[PDB]
């Protein structure tokens, strides 16, 4: 996260770390949506241009975390994956359309003060909240300074970072880029004049964009961190997978297995 701050403890108890077994690496963010299901971006697992294609045994999931690199001994939980599900029309050839994936855990996680699922939106929640100008919040352990062009200064955080960013309108999203934007994406971020800054960055992809409902005080995940051009470049924006539009796919797969 660029221009964010450190998270409070337990502030985002659905944040998950995607962790490669060998070498031990942070791969991506993710999120916990029930005791057994994790949501992330498909590009975290499957990306042919860069010869990326992870399977279940390549990875661990780590839940309950705050520190990026410590093993948080009686706080975090580490889980093995049972099954990865990628959207069957994810578009890695062109624009990362349908950048979504579900991971099934081997055994259910127990919840605690630090481990707690987020909600997925319903139609009326999506409708009321997903408006230009409304802010949501992005969290993660990825770089502090741009690496699309490697940046110095500080590099990597020690703790989970957080930033709040406004939804931007669709025409400005589309006029900021040469990529074909779909209805399965939204963008977010401050406009160059607005004075405030901030963005996701490498290592943040796959994590949550969440919003808090003013009607029932719950947190909903509206976006997944997907792609962007650089990090915190003026006149550019972050693009997020639109979680509600892909919700039928999500419930299709979690209903078909299955207890």
């Amino acid at each position: 996260i660029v221009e964010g701050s450190d998270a409070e403890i337990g502030m985002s108890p659905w944040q998950v770390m995607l962790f490669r077994k060998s070498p031990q690496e942070l791969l991506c963010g993710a999120s916990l949506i029930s005791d057994r299901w994790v949501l992330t971006a498909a590009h975290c697992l499957l990306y042919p241009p860069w010869d990326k294609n992870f399977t279940e045994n390549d990875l661990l999931v780590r839940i309950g975390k705050h520190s990026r690199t410590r093993y948080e001994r009686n706080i975090e939980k580490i889980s093995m994956l049972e099954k990865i599900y990628i959207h069957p029309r994810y578009n890695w050839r062109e624009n990362l359309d349908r950048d979504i994936a579900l991971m099934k855990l081997k055994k259910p996680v127990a919840f605690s003060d630090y481990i707690h699922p987020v909600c997925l939106p319903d139609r009326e929640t999506a409708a009321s909240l997903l408006q230009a100008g409304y802010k949501g919040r992005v969290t993660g352990w990825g770089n502090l300074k741009e690496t699309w062009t490697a940046n110095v200064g500080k590099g990597q955080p020690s703790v989970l970072q957080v930033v709040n960013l406004p939804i931007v309108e669709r025409p400005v999203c589309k006029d900021s880029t040469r990529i074909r934007i779909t209805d399965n994406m939204f963008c977010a971020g401050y406009k160059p004049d607005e004075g405030k800054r901030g963005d996701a960055c490498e290592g943040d992809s796959g994590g949550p964009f969440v919003m808090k409902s003013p009607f029932n005080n719950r947190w909903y995940q509206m976006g997944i961190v997907s792609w962007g051009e650089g990090c915190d470049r003026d006149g550019k924006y972050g693009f997020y997978t639109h979680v509600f539009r892909l919700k039928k796919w999500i419930q299709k797969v979690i209903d078909q297995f299955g207890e």
Partner: peptide, 10 residues
Amino acid sequence: DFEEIPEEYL
């Protein structure tokens, strides 16, 4: 960079 995790997880 990462601290070592328990061998039961690998």
